[PDB]
């Protein structure tokens, strides 16, 4: 058949082969400068784990020299070697790189429902109180929020950044120091082969769900979709949603929508109860304006999450009203140039693809059909207007192409007119065909972020999102 189908086939064989007998597609996260620097600071201050500290030091020097990250992480590494604004500023101040923000202490107090950020901001509050010479300020409720960092094993919620900041704070407390020695051993044991510390253990639930969805959209889905569906469903949280990796108790809308989209196609009867519980999870999060947040009702609706939930819920015709109110929300928030707004993915094409799928997957007629079609047309026009000469898209309009940003654009354009020779979708597919490696895979600059906007590199996601685009486009 076509070069595109042959590319899709080779990629699908590779993705299937990567799924293990437990039904999971492993998705480890690469070492990151920020966490590697914090781990170095912590172990050095505690005069612990000499072998690990030297490996961390070598990792940071190599990475600064060969693949330097964004300027904030660079400044963090240089500090140790020799609200978001408040967080990042206080991190640099704790490492001696700048002054502590002259803010009321309440500036560090956040809603506990945002469990990871809450721990990070409490740890940073303690670091600022001690760093400015006001340790008496710290309240017992501040320390109490940090207690999960003293538990042995992997980090609480698989989050190495939160545990490291918490431990940097806790080492100032005589009452908590008996527990420090054993956790430092666990922290030191996490170093990757390159000597670095990753942000998180991985994103295997997110990645397995997106891969299952891609495989479920092929003409003949492989048999492995069933154990993949099984492996996801048995990991559901009590609220019916899904976190991004095994052992993540905080559910989120992005992960839950990929699981729900996959289960609806590959196991709607076998996992009927998990499907219903995921729909229930989403509906319980829905905001009065018709949008959906990432984690917690009462926080701002987000365009990409609202579009993802619209498409995920659209399968049930009984949810038509909530789905229409979500699509109406997407239309209302489209920007004057046809785009939407970034969040968990750092490229512009991510929210475009989610919006276009919501705008075209829910069947509409009459005035609302025209309104949705016009919005989808402007978004696809934005893609055509910003397409690079090589057929791909980058993270932003002037950036060089990358496969993941291009994959998102392809998913959207597959909802436009039929591909034609030399047209935008045709050229994008040709770009993806050309970027396929001998081993059948893709290598891409990463697009996930956390804490936004700092990039997270989960290399398993490149193959998975390219396969999802090729499954949509063929």
Swiss-Prot record:
Q: Where does Mg(2+) 1 bind?
A: 120
Upon changing residue 354 to A, the result is: Decreased activity by 2-fold
Catalytic residues (UniProt): 254
Which major enzyme category is it? isomerase
Where does the chain bind (2E,6E)-farnesyl diphosphate? 83-84, 114, 116, 452
The cofactor note reads: Requires a divalent metal cation for activity. The highest activity is observed in the presence of Mg(2+), but the enzyme can also use Ni(2+) and Co(2+) in vitro, while is inactive with Mn(2+) and Zn(2+). Binds a binuclear Mg(2+) cluster coordinated with Glu-120 and the diphosphate moiety of FPP.
* Name this protein carries in UniProt: Drimenyl diphosphate synthase
> Which organism's genome codes for this protein?
Streptomyces showdoensis
């Amino acid at each position: 058949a076509t070069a595109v189908v042959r590319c899709r086939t080779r990629l699908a064989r590779r993705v299937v082969a990567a799924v293990g007998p437990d039904g999971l597609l492993p998705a480890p996260c690469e070492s990151r400068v920020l966490e590697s620097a914090l781990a170095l600071a912590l172990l050095t201050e505690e005069r612990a784990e000499a072998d690990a500290t030297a490996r961390l030091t070598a990792y940071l020097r190599t990475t600064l020299r060969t693949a330097p990250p964004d300027p904030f992480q660079c400044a963090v590494a240089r500090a140790v070697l020799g609200r978001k604004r408040l967080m990042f500023r206080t991190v640099l101040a704790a490492l001696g790189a700048t002054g502590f923000p002259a803010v009321p202490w309440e500036a560090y107090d956040t809603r506990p429902q945002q469990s990871w950020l809450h721990m990070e901001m409490k740890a940073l509050k303690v670091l600022a109180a001690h760093g400015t010479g006001h340790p008496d300020v710290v309240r017992d409720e501040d320390w109490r929020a940090l207690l999960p960092a003293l538990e042995p094993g992997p980090a609480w919620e698989c989050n190495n950044l939160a545990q490291l900041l918490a431990l940097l704070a806790l080492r100032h407390s005589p009452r908590h120091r008996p527990a420090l020695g054993d956790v430092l051993k666990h922290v030191a044991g996490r170093l990757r082969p390159d000597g670095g510390m990753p942000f998180i253990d991985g994103m295997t639930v997110f990645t397995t769900a997106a891969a299952g969805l891609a495989l479920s959209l092929l003409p003949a889905p492989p048999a492995c979709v069933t154990p993949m569906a099984d492996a996801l469903a048995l990991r559901r949280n009590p609220d019916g949603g899904y976190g991004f990796h095994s052992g993540v108790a905080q559910s989120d809308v992005a992960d839950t929508c990929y699981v729900l989209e996959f289960l609806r196609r590959a196991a709607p009867d076998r996992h009927r109860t998990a499907v219903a519980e995921a729909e229930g999870y989403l509906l319980a999060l829905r905001n009065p304006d018709g949008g959906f947040p990432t984690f917690a009702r009462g926080t701002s609706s987000e365009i990409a999450m609202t579009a993802a939930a619209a498409s995920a819920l659209a399968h049930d015709p009984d949810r038509r009203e909530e789905v229409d109110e979500a699509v109406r929300y997407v239309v209302r928030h489209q920007r004057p140039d046809g785009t939407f707004e970034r969040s968990w993915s750092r490229n512009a094409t991510n929210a475009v693809f989610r919006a276009v799928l919501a705008l075209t997957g829910v069947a509409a007629h009459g005035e609302e059909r025209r309104s949705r079609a016009r919005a989808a047309e402007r978004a696809l026009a934005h893609l055509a207007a910003t397409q690079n000469g090589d057929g791909g898209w980058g993270h932003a309009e002037a950036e060089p192409s990358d496969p993941i940003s291009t994959a998102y654009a392809v998913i959207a354009l597959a909802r436009g007119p039929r591909a034609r020779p030399g047209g935008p979708l045709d050229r994008a597919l040709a770009y993806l065909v050309e970027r396929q490696h001998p081993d059948g895979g893709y290598r891409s600059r990463p697009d996930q972020a956390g804490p936004r906007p700092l990039l997270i590199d989960v290399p398993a996601l490149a193959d998975v999102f390219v396969l999802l685009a090729l499954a949509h486009a063929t």
